[PDB]
Amino acid sequence: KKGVGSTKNGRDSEAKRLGAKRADGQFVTGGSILYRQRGTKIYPGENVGRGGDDTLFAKIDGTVKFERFGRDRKKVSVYPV
């Protein structure tokens, strides 16, 4: 028998549950978050706000819609009734 070891590549961070949390056409309350992220994969739009964690929340109640800032750049927005 032999003896070996020392992998030193055996860890990783805790998974942080990013991505969208509400869907297009879905009704939303005030203050609800929509898209956890890091930096801006997506920007805010109308009646939507960004936080210190680059997270997107609805300032009001309404319905969600995702769109594009012209080219190669996305957006969300809340539109009320």
Q: Contact 44/2 with Cβ under 8 angstroms?
A: no
Q: Does residue 37 touch RNA according to CB under 7 A? A: yes
Binding residues for other proteins restricted to 9-38, rule: CB under 8 A: 9
7 contributes a contact to RNA by CB under 7 A: yes
SS3 63: strand
Q: Helix, strand, or coil here: 50?
A: strand
79 is in the binding site of which of RNA, other proteins, none (Cβ under 5 to 8 A by kind)?
none
Residue 46 binds RNA, judged by CB under 7 A? no
The amino acid sitting at 10 is G
